[PDB]
Amino acid sequence: ADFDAVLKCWGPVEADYTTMGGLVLTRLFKEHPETQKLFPKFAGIAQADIAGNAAISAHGATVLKKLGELLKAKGSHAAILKPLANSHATKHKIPINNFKLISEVLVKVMHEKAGLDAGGQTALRNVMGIIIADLEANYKELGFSG
Ligand code: HEM
């Protein structure tokens, strides 16, 4: 019931996927600059110009919309997830650790801007842990590391 809880807390996010999408990626890039290089479209953008950047916010919106779809599946996510693992391993070539980095940023932003309290934070970290474990498994099956 870490999923039942999370969906309760998701409302404020789904109310504005574009602003929160922009916040989450800004924070990722400011706190973990090495991750900006993994986005050819965004690499080399001045740190001063990230916040409020429309192309970043638009991609952030896509990120969150897809995470929303994953959360709403409440653990029966294989059919949504596998395609995400497919693209991220073979087209974008993203090492698993980066998924841990954005999960921790999402928790921090939701805590600060969307009312995610200590309890919600725990439930979300548990859900994210499940998803990343599943992503790891799919990466394995694709032969894209360990
Ligand atoms: C839970 C986390 C994430 C979700 C839900 C997600 C979702 C998506 C979606 C829906 C797309 C577009 C469709 C596709 O190509 O699969 C995509 C593209 C992409 N993702 Fe992710 N992503 C996640 C994490 C990351 C991370 C951590 C990075 C690198 C640090 C990353 C790098 C990329 C890149 C480079 C693209 C292509 C952008 C483009 O060409 O416009 N993703 N992501």
Swiss-Prot record:
Residues that, per the record, bind O2: 59
Entry binding sites for heme b: 88
InterPro entries xrefs: Globin, Globin-like_sf, Myoglobin
Binding site for nitrite: 59
EC number: 1.7.-.-, 1.11.1.-
Domain Globin: 1-140
Pfam families named among the record's database cross-references: Globin (PF00042)
Any one Gene Ontology molecular-function term assigned to this protein's record: nitrite reductase activity
One GO-annotated biological process of the protein: removal of superoxide radicals
One GO CC annotation: sarcoplasm
Keyword entries, A-Z: Acetylation, Cytoplasm, Heme, Iron, Metal-binding, Muscle protein, Oxidoreductase, Oxygen transport, Transport
Sequence positions bearing N-acetylalanine: 1
Principal location: cytoplasm
Catalytic activity entry: Fe(III)-heme b-[protein] + nitric oxide + H2O = Fe(II)-heme b-[protein] + nitrite + 2 H(+); H2O2 + AH2 = A + 2 H2O
Subcellular location: Cytoplasm, Sarcoplasm
Family (UniProt): Belongs to the globin family.
PANTHER family in the record: MYOGLOBIN (PTHR47132:SF1)
Subunit structure as annotated in this protein's UniProt entry: Monomeric.
Protein's job: Monomeric heme protein which primary function is to store oxygen and facilitate its diffusion within muscle tissues. Reversibly binds oxygen through a pentacoordinated heme iron and enables its timely and efficient release as needed during periods of heightened demand. Depending on the oxidative conditions of tissues and cells, and in addition to its ability to bind oxygen, it also has a nitrite reductase activity whereby it regulates the production of bioactive nitric oxide.
Name of the protein in its database record: Myoglobin
Protein's organism: Thunnus albacares (Yellowfin tuna)
